[PDB]
């Protein structure tokens, strides 16, 4: 219904189109009011060494060799560009991943904004993970942002961590302020 690009990650696309990416952080950030459901037993991981993290949350008290988590990254975008084109690269970062296998995919808008989402399984560390990656390109005032969310879990924990993941993925929200 919308045709996807094949070459070039969303970030790479933006770089090339001249756009410039400033990572944001939550304290002091107010351009955009983003809800990130915190399911029960789940806590903000401080010091997550995830590069440009806005926030990371996780279920540490749960088990498995892999900790169920959600990562949220927010870049302010500097340069004129066209969101709808950008979004069409929304799937590529996920699809490059080793053994990627799609369960769901959509370029429908999210909370009024151009957005990609893709879900599926891939391999990391001789292990199979199940993840959900949404990118959304929000405008507040004269400013534009890339907001990216990943929700990940061992495949064996899908279902069992199910309500935690639904709640984040489906209750996730992004509003201008």
């Amino acid at each position: 219904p919308v045709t996807p690009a094949i070459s070039g990650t969303l970030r790479d696309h933006l770089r090339e189109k001249g756009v410039k990416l400033e990572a944001q952080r939550p304290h002091g950030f107010k351009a955009l009011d983003i809800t990130l459901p915190m399911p029960p037993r789940w806590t903000q991981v401080p010091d997550p060494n995830v590069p440009d993290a806005f926030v990371v949350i996780a279920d540490r008290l749960g088990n498995s060799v892999y900790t169920s988590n959600a990562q949220l990254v927010v870049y302010r975008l500097i340069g004129d560009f066209d969101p709808a084109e950008a979004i069409t690269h929304g799937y590529i970062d996920s699809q490059k991943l080793l053994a990627w296998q799609t369960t769901n995919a959509s370029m429908a808008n999210f909370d009024g904004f151009p957005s990609s989402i893709i879900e599926g399984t891939y391999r990391e560390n001789d292990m199979t993970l199940n993840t959900s990656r949404r990118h959304v390109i929000a405008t507040s005032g004269a400013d534009k942002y890339l907001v990216s969310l990943s929700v990940t879990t061992a495949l064996s924990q899908a279902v069992t961590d199910g309500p935690a993941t639904d709640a984040i993925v489906n209750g996730f929200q992004v509003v201008a302020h």
Side-chain angles (χ1 to χ4, degrees), residues 1-60 62-176:
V2 165
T3 317
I6 299 309
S7 173
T9 253
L10 176 51
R11 316 259 228 77
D12 296 336
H13 165 81
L14 292 183
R15 261 53 130 317
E16 163 154 334
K17 245 87 235 276
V19 185
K20 261 288 145 110
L21 295 193
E22 279 173 38
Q24 308 305 98
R25 303 270 143 67
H27 170 63
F29 189 77
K30 148 196 57 42
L32 224 45
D33 170 25
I34 293 162
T35 309
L36 183 70
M38 181 108 41
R41 287 145 51 28
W42 271 62
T43 44
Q44 296 203 198
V45 164
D47 289 284
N49 193 31
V50 167
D52 294 328
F54 196 77
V55 75
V56 180
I57 60 169
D59 176 27
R60 304 161 98 186
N63 70 46
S64 180
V65 209
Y66 185 90
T67 323
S68 291
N69 68 98
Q71 305 188 4
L72 178 47
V73 170
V74 178
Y75 293 106
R76 195 163 64 110
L77 305 174
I78 305 302
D80 249 275
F81 77 83
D82 186 2
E85 192 184 335
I87 273 314
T88 52
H89 295 63
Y91 297 167
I92 305 194
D93 44 289
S94 294
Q95 295 167 317
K96 286 192 141 136
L97 298 169
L98 182 57
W100 179 269
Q101 174 102 197
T102 303
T103 68
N104 181 24
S106 171
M107 294 171 161
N109 284 358
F110 196 83
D111 293 338
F113 298 118
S115 195
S116 81
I117 186 173
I118 189 168
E119 316 198 311
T121 57
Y122 72 106
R123 303 271 296 166
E124 186 172 280
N125 293 308
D126 279 275
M127 207 189 341
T128 286
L129 307 178
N130 186 69
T131 190
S132 169
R133 276 126 125 309
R134 171 166 299 283
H135 290 293
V136 19
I137 299 269
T139 297
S140 97
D143 272 294
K144 301 260 254 312
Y145 302 85
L146 177 54
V147 176
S148 301
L149 169 65
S150 295
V151 181
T152 314
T153 261
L155 176 43
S156 79
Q157 296 300 110
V159 196
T160 144
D161 269 326
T165 55
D166 284 32
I168 299 147
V169 169
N170 299 276
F172 175 58
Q173 221 182 321
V174 183
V175 180

